C-alpha cells in the first residue's frame, strides 16, 4: 500500500454542534484523495461541493441560508497491514472553511435583517473510519469526522447591529465507494 494512492466518493453528510439558534444539516458530494506515506501512514484530503444550511428559531422559523467548502487536509494511520482486508483508521489534521451566498430571507428581512456574512475559520480535526478493500481496485468505505469551527456572523438589525459567534462544530458523516490507483 506503500505508494499508493485512491479517491473516494459518496455522501457527506455536515451535522453543526450547539431564543434558539438552530442549524440545520446538510448532506453533499465527498471526495476524497489520499496517499500512503507508508504501509500505515496515510495523507488525505477532503473535498466537497458548497454545503446549505438553514439558520432561524422556534418562533418564526428559517430567516437565513448559509453555504460553505469545509477542505481538510489530514494525516492518518491505518491498522492491521497491507494485506487487510479490513482496515479501519484514524486522523488528526487542519481545517479551513469559507462561507459564501449567504443572505437572509423574506422573513429575516422582514424583520429588519440584511448585509450577512460569515467570517473564514481555520481548526483542529479529527476522524475515525473504516475502509474495506474489496480487491485490489475497490473498496467501500464509512467515516466520521469531527471539525473545530467558529466564525463571527455580521449582518446589520434594522441598524448595525453586525457581530455575533457562530459555533458549528460539527460532526461530518461519510459514506462512500473508492479506487486504488498503484
Not at 1 to 7: K, N, P, Q
Given at each position: 500500500?506503500?505508494?499508493?494512492?485512491?479517491?473516494?466518493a459518496?455522501?457527506?453528510?455536515?451535522?453543526?454542534?450547539?431564543?434558539?439558534?438552530?442549524?440545520?444539516?446538510?448532506?453533499?458530494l465527498?471526495?476524497?484523495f489520499?496517499?500512503?506515506?507508508t504501509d500505515n501512514?496515510?495523507?488525505?484530503?477532503?473535498?466537497?461541493?458548497?454545503?446549505?444550511?438553514k439558520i432561524?428559531?422556534r418562533?418564526t422559523?428559517d430567516?437565513?441560508?448559509?453555504?460553505?467548502?469545509?477542505?481538510?487536509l489530514?494525516?492518518?494511520?491505518y491498522?492491521?497491514?497491507?494485506?487487510s482486508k479490513?482496515?479501519p483508521?484514524?486522523?488528526?489534521?487542519?481545517?479551513?472553511?469559507?462561507?459564501?451566498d449567504n443572505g437572509?430571507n423574506d422573513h429575516?428581512?422582514?424583520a429588519?435583517?440584511?448585509?450577512?456574512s460569515l467570517?473564514d475559520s481555520?481548526?483542529?480535526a479529527?476522524?475515525?473510519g473504516?475502509?474495506?478493500?474489496i480487491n485490489?481496485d475497490?473498496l467501500?468505505?464509512m467515516?466520521?469526522?469531527y471539525?473545530?469551527?467558529d466564525?463571527t456572523?455580521?449582518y446589520?438589525?434594522g441598524?448595525a447591529?453586525?457581530?455575533?459567534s457562530v459555533?458549528?462544530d460539527?460532526?461530518?458523516?461519510?459514506?462512500?465507494?473508492?479506487?486504488?490507483?498503484h
Amino acid at each position: 500500500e506503500a505508494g499508493e494512492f485512491f479517491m473516494r466518493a459518496g455522501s457527506a453528510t455536515v451535522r453543526p454542534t450547539e431564543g434558539g439558534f438552530s442549524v440545520t444539516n446538510n448532506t453533499q458530494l465527498g471526495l476524497t484523495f489520499t496517499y500512503m506515506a507508508t504501509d500505515n501512514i496515510g495523507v488525505e484530503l477532503l473535498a466537497a461541493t458548497p454545503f446549505r444550511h438553514k439558520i432561524g428559531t422556534r418562533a418564526t422559523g428559517d430567516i437565513a441560508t448559509v453555504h460553505h467548502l469545509p477542505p481538510t487536509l489530514m494525516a492518518q494511520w491505518y491498522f492491521g497491514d497491507a494485506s487487510s482486508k479490513f482496515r479501519p483508521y484514524v486522523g488528526a489534521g487542519i481545517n479551513y472553511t469559507t462561507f459564501f451566498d449567504n443572505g437572509f430571507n423574506d422573513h429575516g428581512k422582514e424583520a429588519g435583517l440584511s448585509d450577512l456574512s460569515l467570517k473564514d475559520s481555520w481548526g483542529a480535526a479529527g476522524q475515525v473510519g473504516v475502509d474495506y478493500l474489496i480487491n485490489r481496485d475497490w473498496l467501500v468505505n464509512m467515516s466520521v469526522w469531527y471539525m473545530d469551527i467558529d466564525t463571527t456572523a455580521n449582518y446589520k438589525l434594522g441598524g448595525a447591529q453586525q457581530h455575533d459567534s457562530v459555533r458549528l462544530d460539527p460532526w461530518v458523516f461519510m459514506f462512500s465507494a473508492g479506487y486504488r490507483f498503484h
